[PDB]
């Protein structure tokens, strides 16, 4: 269990429990670094596991593809 897979799996599971979330909610409830979470969000987006939604006067939120 790669520690980078552990962070992505912890992240996916955060989104399962709470639904689409900002990078802020995520890194602070997983007690992780914002730059850590951001890294693995784009990694997970690349491997098509999470996806990002943007909106006017709103923060981007991530949720699970599947």
State the CATH number of the domain containing residue 45: 1.10.10.10
Nearest to 41 by CA among 4, 2, 3: 4
Domain membership of residue 13 as a residue range? 1-66
Q: After which residues is the chain broken (C to N over 2.5 A)?
A: none
Tokens 């699970």 found at: 64
| Helix axes of 34-46 and 3-18: crossing angle, nearest 10 degrees | 90
Tokens 């990694």 found at: 43
Domain count, the chain: 1
**d(Cα 37, Cα 18) in Å, to the nearest integer?**
16
Give the rounded distance of the alpha carbon of 22 from its chain centre.
8
Burial 3-33 (b: 16+ CB within 10 A, else e): eeeebbeebbebbeeeeebebebbbeeeebe
Tokens 């593809």 found at: 65
* 45: enclosing H helix or E strand: helix 34-46
**d(Cα 11, Cα 49) in Å, to the nearest integer?**
11
| Method used to determine the 3D structure | X-ray
């Amino acid at each position: 269990m790669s520690a980078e897979n552990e962070i992505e799996m912890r992240i996916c599971d955060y989104l399962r429990r709470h639904g689409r979330s900002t990078v802020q909610d995520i890194f602070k409830e997983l007690k992780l670094e914002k730059s850590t979470v951001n890294r693995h969000l784009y990694s997970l987006q690349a491997s098509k596991q999470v996806f990002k939604t943007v909106e006017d006067n709103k923060r981007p939120v991530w949720d699970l593809v599947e």
